[PDB]
Amino acid sequence: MTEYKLVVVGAPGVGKSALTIQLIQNHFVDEYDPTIEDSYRKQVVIDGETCLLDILDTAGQEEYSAMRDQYMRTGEGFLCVFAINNTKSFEDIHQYREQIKRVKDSDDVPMVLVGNKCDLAARTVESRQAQDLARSYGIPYIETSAKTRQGVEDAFYTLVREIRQH
Template sequence: MRLTQNMSTISESATPDYPFNRTIKITVIGGSGVGKTALVVRFLTKRFIGDYERNAGNLYSREVQVDGEQVALQVQDTPGVEMTDNTVNLPDHVACSVQWADAVVLVYSVTDRPSFQLMEQLHRLVTRATATGAAAPPIIVLANKADLLHLRRVDPQQGPVLAETLGCSFYEVSASEDYDQVYGAFHRLCCQLAKQQPAAVPLPSQGPAAPPEKRRSPLIPRPKSPNMQDLKRRFKQALSAKVRNVTSV
């Protein structure tokens, strides 16, 4: 199965026979019922599935091409975050996924006002959850269910204003009706991350390369026969004896 669009190049492909230069890790966070899983599945498979079981935090892995380069993509879906007494707390496993990720997608539904009100607090918590000494990951705000105009509870202008205040990119999409919108939002984020990550380079060699060893002839010189040496020695002795006898005569 492949995902290809005319607008750019990002595709799901079979396992390549060479290693990846980059790995992109994305975590998706938002309130319950905003369509996080639907967005992830729509992006990765083009399919829209209306009903999902309660999200237990699935990790989706795909091998993709971003602008012609092979990339390993991992998307961590997370359970819905709830507000209690006007307070939002990230569960430990969600905070760990933030530290793991290269980027975070904050999702709300335009039909759910409380999910929109979560955005500012979630953005603050994501920034705080970043590992000590590390820069906060890129964050984008994604407004879902834009097709449900009759159920809208968040004005179209409020999302962009909030995202600008938070310093994030903003996209309003419909997971159910427009794959291109969903694809475009995730694709731009993948391209941004791919540009930020340096390509893997081979490990440096340990010292200068040794000169190639000269090839040795497979032929082994035959040693001189001890018997032949003995014969030569005896022949010289016999010859010397004859010379002495002649001289004495």
């Protein structure tokens, strides 16, 4: 069956894991638990096609650097996550995307920009800001909340659809 190798990347603490666990295990992880590296494989049906989602959940931190090249080389699509209440994480998105482009030698790699934690009332990143950045990248922008489950399937299924028509 078609397998889609999805990679979730973004700054420490933005909700990479919480989004992934919501998708795979249907619950909000409300606890501090930093990732080193985790993978999740799940059989799903998306728009009638039977497929397997092979998801790598990554660490946002330092050492990784070249350990990042490795998973960026084999990933087919990337969810680029920032948190709407954390401006530095939104600014960090550019470094992740430049790094993906260099390793893939490509200026169009399937990618979705995700503004997570939209359930929080204190936003520091306006939707408009994120929206212009995504359009400058030519990629979709989706806001999500791993807490309410808002936009979670939408964010991952839109990425599969981006891979499908690459």
